[PDB]
Design a protein around this ligand. Structure first.
Ligand code: HEA
Ligand code: HEA
Ligand SMILES: CCCCCCCCCCCCCCCCCC(=O)OC[C@H](COP(=O)([O-])OCC[N+](C)(C)C)OC(=O)CCCCCCCCCCCCCCCCC
Ligand SMILES: CCCCCCCCCCCCCCCCCC(=O)OC[C@H](COP(=O)([O-])OCC[N+](C)(C)C)OC(=O)CCCCCCCCCCCCCCCCC
Ligand SMILES: COC1=C(OC)C(=O)C(C/C=C(\C)CC/C=C(\C)CC/C=C(\C)CC/C=C(/C)CC/C=C(/C)CC/C=C(\C)CC/C=C(\C)CCC=C(C)C)=C(C)C1=O
Ligand code: CUA
Ligand SMILES: [Ca+2]
Ligand SMILES: [Cu+2]
Ligand SMILES: [Mg+2]
Lengths: 153, 151, 287, 59, 254, 57, 130, 57, 51, 78, 49
């Protein structure tokens, strides 16, 4: 699966570079809202079945690594650049930019990574129609398919 | 994976690959089996225990498979019992690992662990007929045996 | 130790000769012979033999380090007791060379347990050697450098031996080049480094003249490098699964065998440097 | 060339095989390397890229 | 001023690339032409009128020679592999010394399997039918950047030089072989330049290498697509605006 | 599918397990080929997970 | 030892089976096993159509020019036609068989089409990532 | 001095072993497996009982 | 190669340093044990560097 | 266990043999094995469907199946 | 020489190998769920074996 992960990441990067149209943006917004509501901002352990709990947690951890940690790294890089700039300007050590600039960078970088990897997180929740999470995932997938005039798994 | 008629010369191809085959600095053992070729590879099923009784005819030898990490000393006069359990479908090579004499270097081993269905097919089609070939050997006999003893 | 063990080897060798010539069938299973008895008797002396080979090597460092450090050696009594415990406990681990022969699991477990327990006195000696180098007046010399190289080789040698003590890994590593690499790093590395260290320590007492530091340094560097380059790739070969005592092997070992040959040639160059060191020292003929 | 015996040397048969249809097809496949010697007027001459010396004279 | 000019040039190149992609997609939208018999042995493609056949789907039968192929370095989905480039022989005599053909780009192959001896198969060197899109290899020839060097004698390539490749192939029809290079393609994939699927494979790489390009992949020009050029132009224009404003403020020195 | 169709005999043939080197670099030189008799007499499926049978007294 | 591995990836769950009619097939197999039918062909849901003689005569293979020498009840289990008890206990498993066959027919009817766009990257939807 | 001579002999035997083991195909002994085994045994015995022992004891 | 099922278990290259195959559970356990054995040396190595 | 991908062979001779086996099986099953000799090989049906999707689609097509049945009846009578 | 290179080299090498070569995975396989896993680098080449 390392080959599959690399291929998916490269596909996401190529799509992000390409850009998105109205329908793609709407579908991505729907997927991101669903993922944030059901995975990121919800305690996965509160679901009913063990299978759905485990797969939802796998999706949540994948989202963490691919979005939250990456955004933290990029925002920290930006905050470190700003910190170096301010240190050179003041000829001393400053501590204000670290928190503020880090938070601003995280807020700037989280939406872009979420848009880039929205499809993967949505697809990883396809546990099955037998469960509540899988049923909601299928409903959102049907809505996205209707919007995009295509069929997806 | 089709047995097609060869328009080339099989003998010429064999001689050419024998003489001037192309090799590389980083060539896998799979493509480089110079000293690891034998005949009638030992076929076993996978995911089940087998009792291996190791012995030697003349002197002490070593049945060695590094892929499985198995080393059994075959000592003359002994019938040493060992447990053999290959937990995966795979083909393993090996070389004897105890000084024995002239052909100590060239004495390879080939053990193929297969899913039970494939192992049973190989059994019924190659080994089971030979167990009665000593007395009865014929296509009708083999068909009768395989139909009579069906798993 | 040699006095204790020599009669066993003599008896085993005499029995082998009798079987070969008079056909006494001592080791013929047909009429009561025990082929494994020969291995038992041989290894009972064989392991104490290697212990006898190694034990004297420690004395060279234990003497040289205090001499150059202007300090007393660390825990001489404890080091003596550690070497003694190794010496008189190596008589119950001769079966680690016979794990796979087919001996009873009880004896196998006893041998493995005592073999792993043997590691502790070696650690004691290592820590004593390390502590002997602290808080003293160091006088760097070629014997001291040889002692450092000996310690560096011995650490890896003993670590690899302890790994071999692992029964499950020993199953795959028996009669492979991993054991070859382990005992080469032990003997050729540590024993020879200690021998050369003692030679440079007693050069004045032996030849009556001082040694030539230039060729001495060249010999040290080249010998240590050759030993390492020769006997490190053998571990890779053992992990790959090359058996022992085989002159023709699969093509997949060419690179590591070439590295081993290069290391051996580097060691030979180091030997050349040692002989040139002796020649130049005698040419200098300085008090 | 063809020394000491054909069964050991097999230069002529190898040359013919390389010059045959099967030899050319194998070379095109690339598993078999190109021929390394040429049979001159009674003598075998290795190519300069073969990385070997010429055979010693028979006297 | 320099960065503003560079950004304007990048925008112009983006527009040109978009127009080129549109026309190439329209050309590829046409059906495929099957060349057989005499047509296959003597392909109509020629440097005189190559532009007529550029980016056109042709099914051609010939005898590839994997033994003497070329491995032009390339990056495909993070893999620093090669684009297999084989001399595709179209007609040969009985002896085989004199032969003619073209250059066929089989597709992307990983670096590990690039060597012939590193593969677990014996390449077939009999007549085979390949559907390919005719291309001039513009991006392949223009890649490599500065200091790029190639050694045809050592069969090591850093960029696709048509004349050197033709010389290496040794075909009699040197002009015909150098005119264009064929790329193995699949005609059952979307004809969208922005598909993001350049090679006909799945996420598991089930298909056996080399992986043939798709129509979208053939249309795609790595590092020179219109969206990338527009992004670069926007960055350069912003840098310009900033530097120009700073210089104007310095000049005013109010 | 452990068997291969033959254009000469118009039948499926199989050989004993062989290493990758033998299969790839010596496909043109094969021997012991035998007609494929089928996994089961009636054509059923033998694809089951086998275990350990009860021991003998 | 206690924590020699220093970490355990308990998150990695058992891979979830994603086969179309696995549940139906397993239920039918369980019912057939409860039927205690010596024949094995009944495992396939379409046995009455693949082996019509299994209900009347039981001769599934043509034993022409081949000896037939049974030694016990386990020799030619496939040559014994189903009896009244076997027929009853297999009729007691018709709902499961019908559902399994319906699922198989639905899977067969399902076909690949150019409409699908996530076909290449279907592993994420199949939940192959962990 | 005798130990130096014996160590040179052992080094020569080790060189023979390494040259034989350099690459497959027996470049040194050219198929003499028995000769190689004899050389290995001689090397081991000489190094053990006639280099280290004479040097130390 | 038992059909399309590639049964080969060892693919070690010319300069292989690890085990020939890692399909065997015994070899997997040995590799993991060796890795963590090497892991558990931080304080000792730092102390030796300092001395 | 690693299994390498390979699409349906679609070999002409192999698919002809498999189609002949399928026709024999259909003829026998239509009459419920009320024939002197049972030549049907149920195993080869799966291989037919796996290796020759084009012929499977033709057989599934009502028109193709009708034409195949007509031709088979003509050949059997003749 | 002593600490940082020896404690970071192997991990760096394995990470780069996974990045650029898919940990040496052999492609052309089916159903990764059933396919075996090609483990990342685990044998410390910097540590004497
Ligand atoms: C000088 C020679 C010598 C010495 C000193 C030793 C010392 C030891 N030996 Fe060995 N051995 C041989 C020479 C020697 N050996 C020979 C020649 C053979 C093969 C004979 C033949 O068949 O031909 C052999 C075979 C052999 C085997 C059989 C392998 C097999 O056949 O598969 C075993 C099994 O446990 C073993 C174990 C040990 C142990 C536990 C020690 C202990 O004494 C070692 C204790 C020391 C330590 C354990 C060091 C602790 C390490 C540190 C303090 C450093 C730590 C640092 C890091 C980890 C970075 N030896
Ligand atoms: C003291 C013991 C000792 C020493 C020093 C060595 C040193 C070396 N050994 Fe050996 N070896 C063994 C004991 C030793 N060996 C044993 C017991 C076996 C098992 C045999 C068997 O099982 O059959 C073996 C097996 C063995 C094999 C396996 C062959 C096979 O199985 O096919 C190989 C392969 O390369 C080998 C190589 C080497 C090399 C390159 C050196 C190099 O280190 C050699 C370089 C030279 C020296 C290290 C000494 C030089 C001496 C001097 C310069 C004189 C010094 C004098 C004074 C200081 C006064 N040895
Ligand atoms: C009476 C006998 C004892 C009771 C029975 C238990 C015996 C069997 C188990 C003993 C060994 C357990 C080893 C676990 C693996 C870790 C090895 C290790 O870190 O070694 C390197 C370490 C030193 O190496 P290090 O410096 O790399 O340490 C790791 C450093 N960090 C975390 C920064 C990476 O050696 C030790 O000192 C380890 C001692 C064992 C672990 C103790 C941790 C504290 C927990 C309470 C212990 C209480 C004592 C009893 C044991 C606990 C259970 C009852
Ligand atoms: C008292 C003395 C005690 C001695 C203790 C024994 C020490 C033994 C170890 C010695 C190591 C010596 C340094 C080796 C450096 C190797 C770097 C390398 O190739 O990368 C490895 C690793 C391997 O990375 P990799 O990605 O290539 O992985 C290997 C290959 N694959 C991917 C297939 C697994 O790379 C790195 O660590 C990358 C960062 C390196 C940064 C530092 C570079 C230093 C370059 C050399 C020094 C500078 C030149 C001038 C030196 C002048 C000296 C006077
Ligand atoms: C965490 O960090 C650590 C590790 O992890 C990286 C460790 O692994 C380890 C474990 C390491 C060890 C136990 C030590 C391992 C070994 C080490 C470091 C040394 C290895 C050294 C090498 C491989 C270098 C090779 C050796 C050589 C001698 C090369 C010599 C090179 C050259 C060019 C010389 C060539 C010359 C000749 C052949 C001779 C020619 C000249 C003459 C004949 C004479 C000429 C004379 C005249 C007059 C002209 C440690 C301790 C650690 O701290
Ligand atoms: Cu048999 Cu070594
Ligand atoms: Ca050799
Ligand atoms: Cu011992
Ligand atoms: Mg042994």
């Amino acid at each position: 699966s390392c080959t599959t992960r690399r291929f998916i990441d490269e596909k996401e990067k190529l799509e992000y570079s390409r850009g998105y149209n109205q329908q793609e943006l709407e579908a991505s917004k729907l997927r991101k809202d669903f993922v944030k509501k059901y995975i990121v901002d919800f305690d996965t352990t509160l679901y009913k079945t063990q299978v759905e709990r485990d797969w939802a947690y796998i999706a949540k951890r994948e989202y963490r690594y691919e979005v939250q940690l990456k955004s933290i790294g990029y925002g920290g890089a930006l905050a470190n650049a700003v910190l170096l700039w301010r240190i050179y300007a003041n000829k001393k050590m400053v501590f204000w930019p670290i928190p503020i600039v880090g938070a601003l960078g995280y807020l700037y970088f989280q939406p872009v990574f979420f848009q880039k990897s929205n499809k993967r997180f949505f697809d990883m929740c396809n546990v099955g129609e037998e469960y509540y999470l899988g049923r909601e995932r299928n409903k959102i997938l049907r809505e996205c398919n209707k919007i995009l005039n295509v069929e997806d798994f | 994976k089709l047995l097609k008629q060869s328009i080339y010369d099989q003998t010429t191809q064999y001689k050419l690959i024998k003489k001037n085959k192309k090799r590389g600095e980083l060539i896998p053992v799979t493509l480089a089996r110079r000293i690891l070729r034998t005949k009638k590879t030992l076929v076993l099923p996978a995911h089940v225990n087998i009792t291996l009784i190791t012995n030697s005819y003349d002197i002490v030898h070593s049945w060695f498979i590094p892929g499985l990490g198995i080393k059994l000393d075959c000592v003359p006069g002994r019938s040493t019992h060992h447990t053999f359990f290959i937990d995966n479908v795979g083909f393993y090579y090996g070389q004897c690992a105890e000084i024995c004499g002239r052909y100590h270097h060239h004495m390879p081993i080939r053990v193929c662990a297969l899913p039970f269905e494939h192992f049973l097919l190989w059994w019924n089609t190659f080994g089971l007929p030979k167990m009665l070939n000593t007395v009865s050997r014929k296509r009708f006999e083999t068909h009768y045996e395989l139909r009579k003893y069906s798993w | 130790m040699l006095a204790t063990i020599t009669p066993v080897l003599g008896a085993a060798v005499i029995m082998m000769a009798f079987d070969r010539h008079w056909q006494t069938t001592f080791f013929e299973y047909a009429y009561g012979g025990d082929p494994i008895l020969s291995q038992h008797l041989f290894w009972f002396f064989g392991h104490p033999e290697v212990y006898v080979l190694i034990i004297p090597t420690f004395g060279f460092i234990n003497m040289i380090v205090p001499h150059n450090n202007t300090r007393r050696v660390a825990s001489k009594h404890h080091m003596i007791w550690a070497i003694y415990v190794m010496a008189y406990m190596g008589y119950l681990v001769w079966g680690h060379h016979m794990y796979l022969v087919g001996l009873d699991h009880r004896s196998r477990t006893m041998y493995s347990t005592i073999t792993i327990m043997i590691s502790m006195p070696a650690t004691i000696k290592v820590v004593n050697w390390t502590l002997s180098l602290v808080n003293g007046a160091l006088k760097i010399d070629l014997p001291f450098l040889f002692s450092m190289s000996f310690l560096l080789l011995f650490l890896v040698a003993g670590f690899t031996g302890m790994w071999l003590s692992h029964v499950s890994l020993n199953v795959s590593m028996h009669d492979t080049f991993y054991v070859v690499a382990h005992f080469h790093i032990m003997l050729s590395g540590a024993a020879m480094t200690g021998i050369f260290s003692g030679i440079y320590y007693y050069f004045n007492a032996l030849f009556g003249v001082k040694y030539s530091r230039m060729f001495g340094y060249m010999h040290l560097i080249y010998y240590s490098g050759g030993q390492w380059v020769a006997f490190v790739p053998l571990f890779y070969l053992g992990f790959s699964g090359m058996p022992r005592r085989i002159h023709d092997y699969p093509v997949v070992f060419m690179g590591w065998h070439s590295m081993s040959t290069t290391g051996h040639f580097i060691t030979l160059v180091g030997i050349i440097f040692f002989f040139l060191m002796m020649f130049d020292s005698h040419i200098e003929r300085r008090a | 060339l063809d020394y000491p015996d054909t069964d050991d040397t097999d230069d002529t048969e190898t040359f013919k095989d390389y010059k045959s249809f099967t030899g050319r097809r194998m070379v095109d496949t690339g598993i078999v390397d190109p021929l390394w010697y040429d049979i001159r007027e009674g003598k075998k001459v290795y190519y300069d890229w073969a990385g070997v010396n010429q055979p010693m004279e028979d006297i | 001023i320099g960065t503003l000019l560079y950004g304007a040039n990048q925008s112009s190149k983006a527009r040109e690339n978009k127009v080129a992609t549109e026309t190439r997609k329209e050309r590829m939208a046409k059906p495929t032409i099957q060349l057989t018999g005499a047509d296959s042995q003597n392909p109509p493609f020629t440097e005189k009128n190559i532009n007529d056949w550029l980016y056109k789907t042709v099914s051609i039968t010939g005898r590839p020679i994997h033994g003497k192929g070329m491995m032009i370095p390339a990056k495909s989905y993070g893999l620093h592999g090669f684009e297999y480039l084989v001399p595709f022989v179209t007609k040969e005599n009985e002896d085989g010394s004199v032969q003619e053909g073209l250059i066929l780009n089989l597709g992307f192959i990983p670096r590990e399997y690039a060597p012939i001896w590193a593969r677990a198969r014996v390449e077939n060197v009999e007549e085979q039918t390949f559907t390919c899109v005719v291309t001039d290899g513009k991006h392949l020839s223009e890649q490599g950047g500065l200091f790029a060097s190639n050694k045809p004698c050592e069969n090591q390539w850093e960029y696709a030089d048509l004349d050197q490749l033709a010389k290496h192939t040794g075909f009699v029809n040197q002009e015909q072989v150098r005119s264009c290079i064929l790329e193995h393609v699949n005609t059952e994939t979307p004809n969208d330049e922005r598909d993001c699927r350049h090679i006909d494979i799945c996420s598991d790489y089930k298909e056996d290498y080399p992986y043939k390009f798709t129509r979208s992949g053939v249309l795609q020009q790595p590092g020179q697509m219109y969206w990338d050029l527009n992004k670069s132009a926007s960055y350069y224009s912003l840098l310009g605006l900033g530097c120009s404003v700073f210089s104007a403020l310095l000049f005013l020195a109010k | 599918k452990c068997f291969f169709f033959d254009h000469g005999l118009k039948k499926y043939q199989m050989f004993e397990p062989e290493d990758m080197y033998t299969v790839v670099f010596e496909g043109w030189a094969l021997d012991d080929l035998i007609t494929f008799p089928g996994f089961t007499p009636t054509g059923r499926t033998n694809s089951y997970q086998i275990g350990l049978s009860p021991r003998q007294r | 030892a206690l924590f020699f591995m220093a970490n355990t990836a308990i998150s990695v769950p058992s891979v979830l089976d994603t086969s179309p009619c696995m549940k139906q097939m397993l239920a039918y197999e369980d019912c057939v096993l409860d039927a205690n039918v010596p024949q094995q062909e009944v495992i396939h849901p379409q046995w009455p159509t693949i082996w019509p003689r299994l209900l009347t005569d039981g001769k599934l293979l043509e034993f022409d020019k081949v000896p037939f020498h049974p030694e016990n009840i386990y020799n030619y289990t496939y040559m014994r036609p189903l009896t009244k008890k076997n027929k009853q206990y297999l009729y007691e498993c018709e709902e499961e068989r019908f559902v399994f066959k319906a699922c198989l027919r639905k899977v067969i009817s399902l076909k690949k089409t150019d409409k699908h766009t996530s076909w290449d990257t279907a592993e994420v939807a199949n939940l192959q990532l962990t | 001095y005798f130990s130096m001579v014996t160590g040179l002999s052992g080094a020569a035997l080790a060189t023979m072993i390494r040259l034989e083991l350099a690459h497959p195909g027996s470049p040194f002994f050219k198929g003499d497996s028995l000769r190689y085994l004899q050389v290995v045994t001689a090397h081991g015995l000489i190094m053990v009982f006639f280099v280290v022992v004479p040097i130390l004891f | 190669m038992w059909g399309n099922l590639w049964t080969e278990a060892s693919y070690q290259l010319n300069f292989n340093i690890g085990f020939s195959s890692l399909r065997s559970d015994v070899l997997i356990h040995l590799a993991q044990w060796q890795y963590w054995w090497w892991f558990w040396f931080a304080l000792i190595w730092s102390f030796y560097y300092f001395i | 266990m690693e299994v390498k991908y390979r699409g349906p062979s679609d070999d002409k001779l192999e698919c002809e043999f498999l189609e002949n086996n399928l026709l024999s099986c259909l003829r026998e099953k239509s009459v419920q094995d009320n024939v002197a000799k049972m030549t049907c090989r149920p195993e080869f049906l799966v291989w037919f469907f796996l290796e020759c999707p084009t012929k499977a689609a033709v057989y599934h097509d009502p028109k193709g199946l009708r034409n195949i049945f007509i031709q088979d009846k003509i050949k059997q009578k003749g | 020489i002593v600490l940082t290179w020896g404690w970071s080299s192997f991990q760096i090498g394995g990470y780069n190998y996974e990045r650029f070569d898919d940990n040496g995975e052999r492609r052309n396989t089916l159903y990764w769920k059933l396919s075996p896993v090609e483990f990342p680098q685990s044998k410390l080449w910097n540590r004497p074996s």
